[PDB]
Amino acid sequence: TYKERIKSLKLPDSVQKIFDDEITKLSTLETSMSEFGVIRNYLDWLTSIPWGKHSKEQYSIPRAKKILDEDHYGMVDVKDRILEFIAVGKLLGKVDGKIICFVGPPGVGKTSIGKSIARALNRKFFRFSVGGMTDVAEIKGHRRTYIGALPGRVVQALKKCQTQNPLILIDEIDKIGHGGIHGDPSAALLEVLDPEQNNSFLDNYLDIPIDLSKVLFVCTANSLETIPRPLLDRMEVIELTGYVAEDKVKIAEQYLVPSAKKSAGLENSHVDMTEDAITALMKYYCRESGVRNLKKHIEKIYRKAALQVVKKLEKINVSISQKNLKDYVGPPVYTTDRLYETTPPGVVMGLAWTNMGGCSLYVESVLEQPLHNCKHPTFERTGQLGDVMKESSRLAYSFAKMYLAQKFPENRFFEKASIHLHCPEGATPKDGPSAGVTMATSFLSLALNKSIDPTVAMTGELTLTGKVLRIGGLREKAVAAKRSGAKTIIFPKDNLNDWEELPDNVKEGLEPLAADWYNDIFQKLFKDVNTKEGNSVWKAEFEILDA
Amino acid sequence: EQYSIPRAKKILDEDHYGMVDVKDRILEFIAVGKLLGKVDGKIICFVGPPGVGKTSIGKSIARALNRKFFRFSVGGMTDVAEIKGHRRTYIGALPGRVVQALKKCQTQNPLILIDEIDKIIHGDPSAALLEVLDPEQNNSFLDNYLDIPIDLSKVLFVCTANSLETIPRPLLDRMEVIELTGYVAEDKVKIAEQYLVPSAKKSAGLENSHVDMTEDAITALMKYYCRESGVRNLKKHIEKIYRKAALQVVKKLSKINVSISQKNLKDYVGPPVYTTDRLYETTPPGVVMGLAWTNMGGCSLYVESVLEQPLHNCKHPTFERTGQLGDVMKESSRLAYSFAKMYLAQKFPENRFFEKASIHLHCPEGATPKDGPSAGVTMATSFLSLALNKSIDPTVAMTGELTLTGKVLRIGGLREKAVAAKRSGAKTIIFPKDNLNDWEELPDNVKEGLEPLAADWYNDIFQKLFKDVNTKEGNSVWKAEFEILDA
Amino acid sequence: SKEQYSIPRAKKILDEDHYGMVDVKDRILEFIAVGKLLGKVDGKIICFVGPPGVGKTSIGKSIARALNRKFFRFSVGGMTDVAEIKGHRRTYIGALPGRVVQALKKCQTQNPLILIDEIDKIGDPSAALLEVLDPEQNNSFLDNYLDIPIDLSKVLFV
Ligand SMILES: Nc1ncnc2c1ncn2[C@@H]1O[C@H](COP(=O)(O)OP(=O)(O)OP(=O)(O)O)[C@@H](O)[C@H]1O
Ligand SMILES: Nc1ncnc2c1ncn2[C@@H]1O[C@H](COP(=O)(O)OP(=O)(O)O)[C@@H](O)[C@H]1O
Ligand SMILES: Nc1ncnc2c1ncn2[C@@H]1O[C@H](COP(=O)(O)OP(=O)(O)O)[C@@H](O)[C@H]1O
Ligand SMILES: [Mg+2]
């Protein structure tokens, strides 16, 4: 019936023999039975895979570069990786197989670059979602001639591409279900992504195994820690980070504005957004580390502009700027210095990195009591701290007590201080030891009645001896510090190399300070303390009542 | 077909009444499609509580574009085989919704309404609706059933959802959500009198000008019997009343015109069942109102801080919490404890209330689960109210998140909170200044009768509420209470 | 061939069957009144909600007596799939009439009453139930063994 495609597809020997046996067995089969329908459905599912149809690789380095940079602006690591792949493929007859994953917060653009890479490599694209996955039924497939059986999604993807060596982009790997009964997709993904096992995939629906060696498995994920170690072992990862304010403005003006303009179908040279409007929107209306909220705001504004311009068929051109910004989106939402421009004693700024990217959290230590009544020294902490951060809080408790009792002998604050520790935004879960120093500076500040120069943000892990250890992720923290108005950033010395690899735009406007021990932080912040001014601070509060 | 803004606006205004914002969004869509030679079948999704009518906009937009309306239920499909189609060679195969729709459209650019997105063996409907609703993969159907190639970009999928949590993120990021909110009392009364009363009257086989509902009667009906923002319960009640009226007129076999007033208000179908605005006018010290948001809508929870015993014969200051507070609300309660304890010392040094007081904190209706930091300032006001022995002007509502330093932070949802405050008889609402933007997006009908108070720090709230508490009487309130236990 | 419109006789018929079930009697009274105000009883299919054992199976026969139409009891739980049981080709040796065929030949009366035995005690038969109960599809059901069109929308179920 459809032997022409079989002849033209250039099948390997064994699979061709299998298909010829199947067709010559079906030739003598009577069409009346439903078994004929089942077997022809199997042949439809079988002949769909292009066993020998593959596209032609692209050899032009400048063409690949010009395709890549026309679609995205600042993500350079992926471009370099693609250029290395292109050069390696050109240097040999044909190279394929490597699997790459992208890790970053939402809005970076790791999903959008899939099509750009597919066009740059002159190959087709497919998108694969594993977010709601909880079983292996849709990965490896089922038995052949079940009435309700559906084959695996990988062979379906191959059919949709209808050409070998495609580009299959897995949407999520960190959102894979744990897996109870009916299947555990992690093992199926392990089998699929093994570089050497790809030659013998051995799908359940088709007993003949398909060659996945030429297939390019691109990957997208948010958090690296959720992925199990077996999966991460066989896959290479590239960290796609956030964008600076100037980089966000460049990305917006270059790509987001024309994309929203053409989505609403507005003629050029009629409606445009000025630079001040975009920078004001991003700075005073949004806080996310990507450009997604900016994109939705731009699309909504351009839809409103389209509605305005259609209804008229003083000016035929619409200009969007500061003076008419609060007519398209409304009053502003957030504020850069959102808590307070100044800082009372006991409050310390700090940085954090969550699934949504970099952010700034404050740490507030207060006396849950009058000036000094207490009659019992107690330490209380609230907020969604988590186990690691609660342990960091206790360690900071002990370290601050020892540090005062060493540096300032007769400062007896912790003898009868009932301290309450809170991290604002109490509905947002927090974790990680990166605030270990941040809390240590808080209590000390609360115990010295001194501010911490609100233009200063700090991070790092603290130990009982005062040593400051490495932290997992600095560039996002630095971007968050720059966004929130901090000019001085305190990071552990171990991250100094991580500070050197930062782009010149991230480092600009931020004053580095690599602290090995906590003494460096104390000297940087508590300067005017003369060992007698910061000593006997609560002399009146102890003599009059506490005796 | 053709995109004419005025006639579409008139059609939408005739079909629905209080959907000003949704009508504006639909007009935006029509204007966007006008400048293009063909609408590219962009997918529009509606998110709102059931009962607001989001299944009715389908007909209005279909006839505004002069197109047929199609309906599709996802809650009954689990397998993808019923979507891709079945060949006619099979004896047992039956046409699915996709095949039947493709047969009976008979015209390009159809419109299909999805029953629900919150309603998800040998089949995963999530993947099926993913490939249906994926704009990039939508164009790759290429079925061999039709010799001529066909394009799936002609379908304007319309979604339906109550809570955005159920929608997965991979679906959410490629889907545009249009939010539909509830209707205030007046809006729901107009919607009823204009669409539900005539439709239910005709359904019960009753021509108009036979039985009528007075304004007071219908308002009492939608107040004491209807609480949720939708009109499902209102429609059911109207249908039941008109069925009873039809039975009565059959029994009479006929005067004919009977009026439903408030003096004899629905005594044949029972008395009021839901009532909230009769608790108590005068609010005692330590009790304060606050607003909460749930999927049902807005509500008014009280917060009562009391002494377990009179202060003159109590010791060992303890803090107790009841109600289904949860972790975040308990942490907010502890924060309010600390903030009030520090605030009295800062303002009234000689008031030693918290030194020897055992406080008990409750939220009435202790069976309903609660959560969220939106009551952070609500609790902190109670303790001071209990400490200063001062009432809190019972005609005020309060919400906001509090920190240790004493700042009010942004809260998650002010429209339903404002509606609940208005429904509860409050004439003043205290909300964070960061939420002022939301206060400027509320319909103008909500804002009358409520005096806004945007506060950054708690000092604003304290000055607004505690005006007649000077530093001479504020720090000397118990006094004689501490003249007994200190000897 | 004609419907009964006398409410009092239906009330008296329902009275002797059960002692103090007044809400269901009243509801069927408004149902009959609504049908009286219209040309034909259509728009809703009567369905009862309650714990088992209160007698929601003799109600079908009671309503049949009140409406004075023949009663037929149909078991949906005997269905396995939505494809194999919904009829057979006429040209095949395996032709077999559907359940509607024997229901109609037993009733021999327009608008016969059909009672579903168990739905909450049973691909999936939900699709078949939707196809046979939704009035939008009952106008042109066209059973495989029934060449003549059958309008199931006029047919009332319990
Ligand atoms: N450098 C850039 N140049 C052009 N467009 C960009 C750039 N960075 C981001 N974008 C755009 O911003 C939007 C957000 O990207 P996208 O949603 O693909 O990424 P993501 O949020 O990391 O992914 P996901 O939603 O799958 O987790 C896209 O429209 C993308 O094209
Ligand atoms: N303005 C209105 N005019 C007419 N009918 C309305 C209006 N608002 C709501 N309704 C009715 O309320 C019902 C709400 O149903 P809906 O909640 O959309 O269903 P679902 O929960 O499946 O989304 C609709 O059937 C509609 O008939
Ligand atoms: N007034 C009554 N007193 C006692 N039993 C009754 C009464 N009315 C009905 N029943 C019983 O209820 C039984 C059926 O109840 P129900 O559970 O609703 O139906 P089914 O058993 O078919 O689900 C009948 O067998 C009948 O004997
Ligand atoms: Mg991601």
- Residue A343 carries which DSSP code? -
- Ligand nearest the Cα of residue B182 is 2
Supply A509's token pair: 């406007």
B53 is an annotated ligand-binding site residue? yes
Structure-token match 């120069």, residue found: A453
Among B362, B392, B205, B437, which Cα is nearest to B285's?
B392
Instruction: Determine whether the interchain pair B328/A384 forms a contact, defined as Cβ–Cβ distance below 8 Å.
Output: yes
Structure-token match 């319990």, residue found: C158
User: Between the CA atoms of A32, A36, A38 and A44, what dihedral angle is there, to the nearest 10 degrees?
Assistant: -130
Beta pairing partners, A460: A435
Question: How many beta carbons lie within 10 A of that of residue A377, not counting itself?
Answer: 13
Resolution value in angstroms: 3.3
H or E element at residue A156: helix A153-161
Tell me if A138 sits within 8 A of A272, measured CB to CB.
no
How were these coordinates obtained? cryo-EM
- Residue B209 Rama label (left phi>0; alpha psi -120 to 50; beta): left
Which of A295, A416, A450, A477 is catalytic? The answer is: A477
Question: How many beta carbons lie within 10 A of that of residue B330, not counting itself?
Answer: 15
In this structure, the strands spanning B287-293 and B298-307 are: antiparallel
- Alpha-carbon distance B255 to nearest alpha carbon in chain C (angstroms): 18
> φ and ψ at A311, to 5 degrees?
-65, -15
| Torsion over CA: A48, A51, A52, A53 (sign) | positive
List chain B residues with CB under 8 Å of A331: 436-437, 440
Query: How many Å lie between the centroid of ligand 1 and the Cα of residue A257?
Result: 14
Which of A434, A442, A445, A484 is catalytic? The answer is: A434
Among B349, B440, B353, B455, which Cα is nearest to B401's?
B455
Residues of B (161-220) whose Cβ lies below 8 Å from A: 168-170, 173
Q: How far is CA A109 from CA A104, A241, A251, in A?
A: 9, 10, 11
Q: Quick one: angle between helices A518-525 and A436-448, nearest 10?
A: 40
- From the number of C-beta atoms within 10 Å of its C-beta (0-12, 13-18, 19+), residue B209 rates as exposed
Among A380, A368, A534, A519, which Cα is nearest to A441's?
A519
Binding-site residue ranges of C for ATP? 50-57
User: What's the CA gap between A20 and B62, in Å, rounded?
Assistant: 52
Instruction: Determine whether the interchain pair A371/B345 forms a contact, defined as Cβ–Cβ distance below 8 Å.
Output: yes
C-alpha C22: how far from chain center: 23
First to last CA, chain B: 90
In this structure, the strands spanning A271-273 and A318-320 are: parallel
Q: For B332, which of A306, A307, A426 is closest by C-beta distance? A: A426
- From the number of C-beta atoms within 10 Å of its C-beta (0-12, 13-18, 19+), residue A41 rates as middle
User: Between the CA atoms of A314, A317, A321 and A325, what dihedral angle is there, to the nearest 10 degrees?
Assistant: 70
Supply B20's token pair: 């000003």
Q: For A37, which of B31, B89, B170 is closest by C-beta distance? A: B89
Query: How many Å lie between the centroid of ligand 2 and the Cα of residue B61?
Result: 14
| Torsion over CA: C27, C30, C36, C38 (sign) | negative
**Quick one: which atom of ligand 1 is closest to the CA of A104?**
22
Supply B29's token pair: 């869509």
- Pick among A38, A111, A310, A363 to test the B interface (most B CBs inside 10 A): A310
> What string of DSSP letters covers A245-301?
HHHHHHHIIIIIHHHHHHHTTPPTTTEEE-HHHHHHHHHHH---SSSHHHHHHHHHH
3-state secondary structure chain B: CCCCHHHHHHHHHHHCCCCHHHHHHHHHHHHHHHCCCCCCCCCEEEECCCCCCCCCHHHHHHHHCCCCCEEECCCCCCCCHHHHCCCCCCCCCCCCHHHHHHHHHCCCCCCEEECCCCCCCCCCHHHHHHHHHCCCCCCCCCCCCCCCCCCCCCCCCECCECCCCCCCHHHHHCCCEEECCCCCHHHHHHHHHHHHHHHHHHHCCCCCCCEEECHHHHHHHHHHCCCCCCCHHHHHHHHHHHHHHHHHHHHHCCCCCEEECCCCCCCCCCCCCCCCCCCCCCCCCCEEEEEEECCCCEEEEEEEEEECCCHHHCCCCCEEECCCCHHHHHHHHHHHHHHHHHHHHHHCCCCCHHHHCCEEEECCCCCCCCCCCCEHHHHHHHHHHHHHCCCCCCCEEECEEECCCCEEECCCCCHHHHHHHHHCCCCEEEEEHHHHHHHHHCCHHHHCCCEEEEECEHHHHHHHHCCCCCCCCCCCCCHHHCCCCCC
Nearest chain C residue (CA) to B244: C30
Tell me if B436 sits within 8 A of A331, measured CB to CB.
yes
